[model samples]
Target: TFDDGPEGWVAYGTDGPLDTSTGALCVAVPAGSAQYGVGVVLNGVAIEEGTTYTLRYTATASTDVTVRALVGQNGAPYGTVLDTSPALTSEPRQVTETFTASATYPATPAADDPEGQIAFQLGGFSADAWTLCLDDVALDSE
Candidate 1:
């Protein structure tokens, strides 16, 4: 049977349900902070090296917003801005972007899909209150 939990395949908020916003679902973060982020692992799918993989997610910004992809270890991200999108606003709209992580992940990586474990972080904006919605996010190899 399939279950929706970290131990299963999908992991959410540390304690209760994940964070929420009047506009969209996001891990809330304050200005000049550690940064807001989210990530998940895709089991059994090893991303090939030197290959291009496309990641797409539907997001809307309260005020012109900028989002980017940050590749990291396990599910903990660090070092590098794989790809990012410029700020888009004026109204709630869907912004799309793509990225190809490093040519190859480190050898003997713990996860089956280290590259797939890549994370997406949204940060550095001028809006006092912004909303970014991410739904139906998916990854495909091309």
Candidate 2:
């Protein structure tokens, strides 16, 4: 969605967000790596404090997959974990998971915004040996 003709979509580390036409948002599975995180702005949603939401995604062929959807300010530190979905087993095939927002996250003043952003960070202790197919991505009230 970052590259589907909506201007001003920013990519955190890279020069630009991944062109969704390529159909993949990838990062090496490792700690302390530079390119392991990505951010996207959710433009029109009334994300309020104390109100929970869920972010769901499908992944494929990932080993030690631990994904976090961080709720960050427009230009500030990652405030808190809105939701986290950590998988214990290696995903030999595609799988889907729904991550519900942490109660503490949306409770903070920083997490409130009618127009805010979500950054998708994928990584684990392992290094550069993970692959996944992500699709049907959606964020909604819950």
Candidate 3:
């Protein structure tokens, strides 16, 4: 069983405006965004130390775009679970990656913030305004 809703997804970054109004994870990058700015993340994901996990998802941009995808801690001193970058086009593409957790997750994270999450760093990918959408994203133990 799986869920593709945007329930746990949160948009971040100090630059650009956000527009996820379309339900699935969609971001509109503006002129002020940076390479890692204006991104989307999903918290409360299951991640344990020394465990390997696989991440899968479908993503597309209004035009050509570059995105950095990773699984890590949602708090300070971020811990990396997985990380990669995928170039995208208007034609929706599927992305898959695997990585081992570098740190153990906290049992009780702060409200509205969890220790484990998958994120898409979408910014500076395109010089002009571009829209990015994501679907069918899942993280599983390998």
Candidate 4:
């Protein structure tokens, strides 16, 4: 579980800070935002093509929400998405999604090339304000 602490996490695209107010690191997404994304970068980790990984997370929302676990190379252009979750539902439960790396991402990165990255992008919400609380996000090799 990522209930440990908010050390390597980062929020982007309308995502809010980690809220320790709940005894765990949780991010809040304001309503009306088209998209919200958050994740941690495994700095020294390089994703090898043809390898498979499992992404798991826990989250809840004020209303129905759609979350996607995205895997790709990270950097300038943020490599093409190797995998993404089907539209997810916010049930306050643990969700596990799997992905296989593609050869499309160059194993040897060129100057300014995107490195590897995995992120959770939340979208598809109504006008009602909602809080998307996330925790226990992990990507493990399979």
Candidate 5:
């Protein structure tokens, strides 16, 4: 839970600043870019083949924006099994989704080998510079 901090989450592809000092994941995203120019990720999530899992998270944006939250392999083919774009406004909102893993990731979890990611895609907006804050993230197998 981000109530304790970023909890191993890190910013990715954003030239803007990232802050989690307030017990939430916040990223300053520059306006106008590729589909995934900026985001955040929690690595090493164990995604097993055919395992059903659920992702739940809350977010708020300085302005209206859409962001992708998903479980996927963070490299090579960029395999994404579960994905969704959640709309955020000044008001905080929570999103919950469930999916079955199509393929296993990493083959191991306690090593330096490849791993899966729980990511939030935060770029690709038409507005000016914006701030996105995320919290209460949970990924549990069902």
Candidate 6:
């Protein structure tokens, strides 16, 4: 299902700051840190085990960084990683990764289910600081 922000996206980070105070979801990872964080959580996307899906989004970063799509249950990390995109440039570009749903899944994830979450990570490099911005995020069947 396509969501136009009916209002159910959460931001989380490991060691940096997650900034969603603006039009776009932005994350900042300080230099000399190997931290990673989520730009936003795509909540309530009902997923079936063994099913394949593609997660897509538009991303731009201060430095070239990696983007990852991870599965979760109850708004936090749970299942196996769906996929991780290659280095994304500073200029806006579309990022897509296909992954198969694991055998153990929420069966049905909704806005209320804490176990129903999909997160997008936007920092993996440890040599430079990163400011990753994301927009138009989506998860679709493959």
Better of 4 and 5 by TM-score: 5
Runs in model 5 deviating more than 4 A are 1-4, 107-113
Q: For candidate 4, report its TM-score.
A: 0.72
Clashing pairs in 2: none
Query: Model 3 residue 65 lDDT?
Result: 67
CA-lDDT, candidates in order: 0.44, 0.44, 0.73, 0.59, 0.80, 0.62
lDDT, model 5, position 38:
81
Q: Write the per-residue lDDT of candidate 4 for residues 1-142, one digit (tens) a residue.
A: 4555656656664455656566445566656656443343333246767788787777676676555666776666666444565443456678787777664444455676655656666544545556666667777779
Per-model TM-score, in order, reads 0.55, 0.52, 0.79, 0.72, 0.87, 0.67
Residue 81 in candidate 4 has what lDDT?
45
Where model 6 places Cα greater than 4 Å from the true spot, the runs are: 1-6, 14-22, 36-39, 73-77, 107-114
Q: What lDDT tens digits, residue by residue, belong to model 1 across residues 1-142? A: 1112223233232223333333234433234422453322233334555667676655555666565543444433433324464455545455444556564555335655343344545444543544444444556677
lDDT of 5 by residue, 1-142 (tens): 4656666788876665577778887888877756777888888887889999999888998988777888887776678878788889989898889899998887345343358889888777645778888888888999
Candidate 6, residues 18-97, lDDT tens digits: the string is 55566566767555653353345666667777788887777787876665656666544455546455577789898777
lDDT of 3 at 2: 19
Point out where model 4 deviates above 4 Å: 36-45, 85-90, 104-110
Clashing pairs in 5: none
- The model with the greater lDDT, 1 or 5, is 5
Which candidate wins on lDDT? Answer: 5
Best first by TM-score, ranked: 5, 3, 4, 6, 1, 2
